[PDB]
Ligand binder design. Structure first.
Ligand SMILES: [Cl-]
Ligand SMILES: [Cl-]
Ligand SMILES: [Cl-]
Ligand SMILES: [Cl-]
Ligand SMILES: [Fe+3]
Ligand SMILES: [Fe+3]
Ligand SMILES: [Fe+3]
Ligand SMILES: [Fe+3]
Ligand SMILES: [Fe+3]
Ligand SMILES: [Fe+3]
Ligand SMILES: [Fe+3]
Ligand SMILES: [Fe+3]
Ligand SMILES: [Fe+3]
Lengths: 178, 178, 178, 178
């Protein structure tokens, strides 16, 4: 039995470029987490309590996604490499602008998974594509959800009254079509 | 065993300036109570039923705070001195103006506690600082809450529709971020 | 009513050096979180499943501590400033060495709170000392707990059999004296 | 409507090389079953009752995996071909050596699924890749589990005391990190 780079028994070696791509994607998930924390704070500073609660939960979920990836590297007997985390964006001119950043970040998270997926396919790593499949499935739902939240906020067209209504929807957990 | 000024057995004497400051602070809490009653009435006169209910409860809470302080003087074997209570403010041009007075009054209540606290520290009265610690803790929460209510009302920007939505939030007990 | 730096109504201004110290302490808590994640992974790579579960939970708790601090700045109408997060340490020669780093990090977290506390006292910021008091209380318990875990691991004196027993204790949630 | 080779109505023909690969993989699963039975017996002969119970259950699970594959061939209207089953290995010098064989066999089972998967992809058989996807997912978990059991046994470093502790873990059903 061979030992993998993290010391555990190795079921099958992983291409180093794919390993690096997974480690970098973990940073993407961690950065989405701190970005959603920053967005939570921006909303709290404006008394948008439902948006604050939504993004507070979204931050914890993105962190869970990151940890899920660290567990996969453990399962593959690969080393993790937790990286320096950039500071998040913290300023937005409006809720609509914030929601646009949130949507783009979910789409960018999917793009990063897609890049890892294509690398795994080039390397015939079927464990990794199988691992990523349900994560892409969840990304479709998250993109649908954030397109819903962004589109509903844009429909409000900057009216505080409409934004309060939507804020209360989010506080109640009404966060997708769905 | 020595007897304190209110006749009970005395665990430790209290500096007269600190006693006077506590008695005056009890008046501050009593004045916040009647001010919140006046604010309740102003809201009721304008059919802002959720704001009326909120301030009706806030008036009773401030009275409870005052009584809590009277119990501490009893516990320290000090005399209470219930003072003349000024008439509250009763007129405001708008809900936003009323909420600004409410926020300033909570901040002013904390300032009065802070002044009592500094006096107790100058006199090395650790019973009094320990007594006040949870009250300052509650003031942080109350300031956070009234900053939330004021900020949300200002966000409404005087729109009756938005104010009705917020009014219904308060009637439902949705009164902080939180 | 004055507006604080984050835009909310301001109950009382905060000294900029104290604000900076709180923002930096939030980074300390966030760094403890990612450090405990790294420690969780190190334990998982060595099949120390109880230690892995313990540090996985500790990482989430430290993140909760950080968020608790961000909420206080919101409550004080102060701006948050989420900072770049350094990469954690990820290599240890033994479980005893890892537990020593964990203990030192808890002690260093308390030292950072103590530094914030002394600054608040110099500035007569009683809201901040009251806010920090229960956090120091929790630090005493955490230091007691990590001294217990470290001391028990050192008692094992590197024997794998004893470390498996302790590992199972942690998996069962037996993590303090207590 | 065309009839498939096993006589049922045929939704889509299957490449004969892919069929042969699936039939051979069923033998791999059946061989893992009898190997785990042999390992169960080896453990029982040494009073390692928790390991015996674990491998007794693992033998039944591998048989279930084999039957799952026979059902897929039925569903595809393909003939099964249950093959001669080799005798399992039955002798090991130590528990660590046995656990190494167990881990290698799980990795080899995944390799066999991977070979079937690549053949299905060459033949654009999306039914078969979809069928195999959750099976690879389960293999990741099984490899993680057997790397955990092997690594924990190796950590014991041949100490009977540590092996008794681990044996009791397995009897209690504590068989992964997890
Ligand atoms: Cl907007
Ligand atoms: Cl108004
Ligand atoms: Cl050790
Ligand atoms: Cl052994
Ligand atoms: Fe994510
Ligand atoms: Fe996401
Ligand atoms: Fe009060
Ligand atoms: Fe008050
Ligand atoms: Fe902490
Ligand atoms: Fe800590
Ligand atoms: Fe199997
Ligand atoms: Fe298997
Ligand atoms: Fe799938």
């Amino acid at each position: 039995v061979a030992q993998g780079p993290n010391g555990r028994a190795l079921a099958e070696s992983m291409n180093p470029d794919l390993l690096s791509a997974i480690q970098q994607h973990i940073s993407i998930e961690r950065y989405a987490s701190v970005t959603y924390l920053a967005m939570s704070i921006w909303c709290a500073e404006r008394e948008l309590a439902g948006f604050y609660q939504f993004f507070d939960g979204a931050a914890k979920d993105e962190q869970s996604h990151a940890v899920h990836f660290t567990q996969y590297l453990i399962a593959r007997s690969q080393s993790n490499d937790l990286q320096t985390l950039d500071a998040p964006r913290q300023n937005w001119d409006s809720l609509a602008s914030l929601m646009a950043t949130a949507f783009q970040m979910e789409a960018d998270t999917t793009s990063s998974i897609q890049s890892v997926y294509a690398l795994a396919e080039r390397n015939s790593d079927t464990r990794t594509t199988v691992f990523l499949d349900p994560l892409i499935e969840a990304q479709i739902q998250s993109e649908d959800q954030f397109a819903y939240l962004l589109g509903r906020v844009k429909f409000a067209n900057g009216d505080p009254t409409a934004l309060l209504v939507i804020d209360n929807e989010l506080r109640a957990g009404q966060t997708q079509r769905g």
